[PDB]
């Protein structure tokens, strides 16, 4: 029915792992291949198909070391997953913007034939941190056939992005004390329409560098999130819908369910 489908059927435990059920190879990418971006590292499932494609994009003064595991353990459930460097650390959000479209173009234009022939250009997503994560809602906001923008504990200048329809998945940290969800990410929850397929997820215990290790709840729902409009797969809506509850990980989850 659904010919975008990938991987076993889901479960809790199956999305909590380390590593998903994909095994994925690498294709470094130098920064001299890199055009308008500071390269970075192409992740990509070794099975022979098509999936979507997701860049994501660290945040001030980070490099892609910082959300290295994340893009591994995403293209482990069936993505090609780039973590880019920047240009420079210092780069603002709407450059980063620039950069994840920069990183969408290299994957599918400028990789190997190996990375490009697992691509299904058609079903592109963005993600960032914090400064990469203002740059996930402004490309969002530009480029409107993206299938998923994930902006974890996002900041940009600008808090209203109600023009964005792309289903759009706020990660928040209840900690986090550089870009508050309280000014930043719940401001720009709040400014994205009803209308839109959304969800605001707020870490627990959580600063606002906890995206840049291992974290099973934020590895669950991004792939989540990744899976039901990426790939349009239903079999995780009940994931994202009621969705998580709390009392444990998750401090709190709003959402426009159902989906
Ligand atoms: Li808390």
């Given at each position: 029915m659904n010919?975008?489908?990938?991987?076993?059927?889901?479960?809790?435990?199956?999305?909590?792992?380390?590593?998903?059920?994909?095994?994925?190879?690498?294709?470094?990418?130098?920064?001299?291949?890199?055009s308008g971006f500071?390269?970075?590292?192409?992740?990509?499932?070794?099975?022979?198909?098509?999936?979507?494609?997701?860049?994501?994009?660290?945040?001030?003064t980070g490099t892609e070391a910082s959300i290295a595991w994340l893009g591994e353990r995403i293209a482990s459930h069936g993505f090609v997953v780039?973590?880019?460097?920047?240009?420079?650390?210092?780069?603002?959000?709407?450059?980063?913007?620039?950069?994840l479209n920069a990183a969408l173009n290299h994957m599918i234009n400028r990789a190997?034939?190996?990375?490009?022939?697992?691509?299904?250009?058609?079903?592109?997503?963005?993600?960032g941190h914090s400064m990469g994560g203002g740059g996930s809602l402004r490309l969002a906001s530009q480029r409107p056939d993206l299938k998923a923008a994930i902006p974890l504990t996002p900041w940009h200048l600008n808090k209203n992005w109600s023009s964005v329809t792309v289903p759009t998945l706020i990660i928040g940290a209840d900690l986090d004390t550089i870009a508050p969800v309280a000014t930043s990410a719940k401001p720009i929850?709040?400014?994205?329409?009803?209308?839109?397929?959304?969800?605001?997820?707020?870490?627990?215990?959580?600063?606002?560098?906890?995206?840049?290790?291992?974290?099973?709840?934020?590895?669950?729902?991004?792939v989540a999130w990744l899976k039901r409009f990426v790939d349009n797969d239903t079999r995780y809506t009940q994931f994202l819908c009621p969705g998580p509850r709390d009392g444990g990980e998750v401090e709190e989850y709003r959402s426009t369910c159902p989906f």
């Open positions: 010919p975008y489908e990938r991987g076993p059927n889901p479960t809790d435990a199956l999305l909590e792992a380390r590593s998903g059920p994909f095994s994925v190879s690498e294709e470094n990418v130098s920064r001299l291949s890199a500071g390269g970075g590292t192409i992740y990509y499932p070794r099975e022979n198909n098509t999936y979507g494609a997701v860049a994501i994009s660290p945040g001030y780039i973590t880019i460097d920047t240009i420079t650390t210092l780069d603002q959000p709407d450059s980063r913007a620039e950069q190997s034939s190996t990375v490009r022939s697992r691509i299904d250009s058609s079903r592109l997503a963005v993600m929850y709040n400014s994205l329409p009803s209308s839109i397929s959304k969800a605001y997820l707020e870490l627990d215990g959580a600063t606002h560098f906890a995206p840049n290790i291992p974290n099973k709840i934020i590895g669950k729902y991004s």
